[PDB]
Amino acid sequence: ATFEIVNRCSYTVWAAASKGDAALDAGGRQLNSGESWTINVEPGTNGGKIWARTDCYFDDSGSGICKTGDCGGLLRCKRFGRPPTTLAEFSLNQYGKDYIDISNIKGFNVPMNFSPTTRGCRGVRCAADIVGQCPAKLKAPGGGCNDACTVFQTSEYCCTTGKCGPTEYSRFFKRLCPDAFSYVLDKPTTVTCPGSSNYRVTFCPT
């Protein structure tokens, strides 16, 4: 499957792509404002994520740090990134269909549109100014808007027991972005697409 990753932000981002225990494609790359990077994701990939990272420094070996979404200090991510990270999430070729969503469960850093480039389903978007409107207690000093689990480490926010409800914090993310997951047991906003669809992830779509 192809994923075209487009940075429409006025600032550089370092795109990342992983399934948690492995890179997808090269795993990460710099995208200056306006740049597009097309990756190949193996059919059947389950639990893949794409995100942006901000305010990164890398040495000539590809080692360094980002202020949001850092993946073990690597340019080429092999693992998931440090919150806050707006997440484009997907599982491909799962009994004949693909499943896509955007999640704010691990916070928000950069606005995102995640849409098919092929027929048969709709895209999803979270492009509201979540950083600017972020509740004070959720603001990440390093940049972005943290989820409540990251900040407070409670069973209720982290849904540890598999019993949790919406919270004042989850409802903030849901109000700004109805079409993204705001907490673990949110009513799903997952879109079913034809198996083997292709996609575009646009940072700063609006």
Key features of this structure:
monomer; 206 residues; mainly beta; Thaumatin; seven-stranded antiparallel sheet; five-stranded mixed sheet; 4 helices; 12 strands; signal; cytoplasmic vesicle; Thaumatin_CS; Thaumatin I
What would your notes on this structure say?
It is found in: Cytoplasmic vesicle. The chain has 206 residues and is mainly beta. The chain has one domain: Thaumatin. It has four helices and twelve strands, in the order ββββββββββααααββ. It has helices at 130-133, 148-152, 155-158, 168-176, and strands at residues 2-7, 13-18, 23-31, 36-40, 48-58, 64-68, 87-94, 97-103, 112-116, 124-126, 191-194, 199-203. The relative contact order is 0.20.
CATH topology type: Thaumatin
CATH class: Mainly Beta
Counting helices, strands and paired strands, the structural category is mainly beta
- Sheet with most strands: 7 strands, antiparallel
Helix and strand run: EEEEEEEEEEHHHHEE
Distance between the termini: 25 Å
Tally of helical runs = 4
CATH architecture: Sandwich
Compute the number of strand runs.
12
Cα-atom radius of gyration:
16 Å
CATH superfamily: Thaumatin
Number of domains: 1
Which strand-content bin applies to the residues? 35-45%
> Which overall shape is indicated by the principal axes computed on the Cα atoms?
globular
What share of the residues lie within helices? 10-25%
PDB class: plant protein
Keywords: Crystals on loops, Thaumatin, plant protein
Assembly: monomeric
Entry title: Thaumatin crystals grown from drops
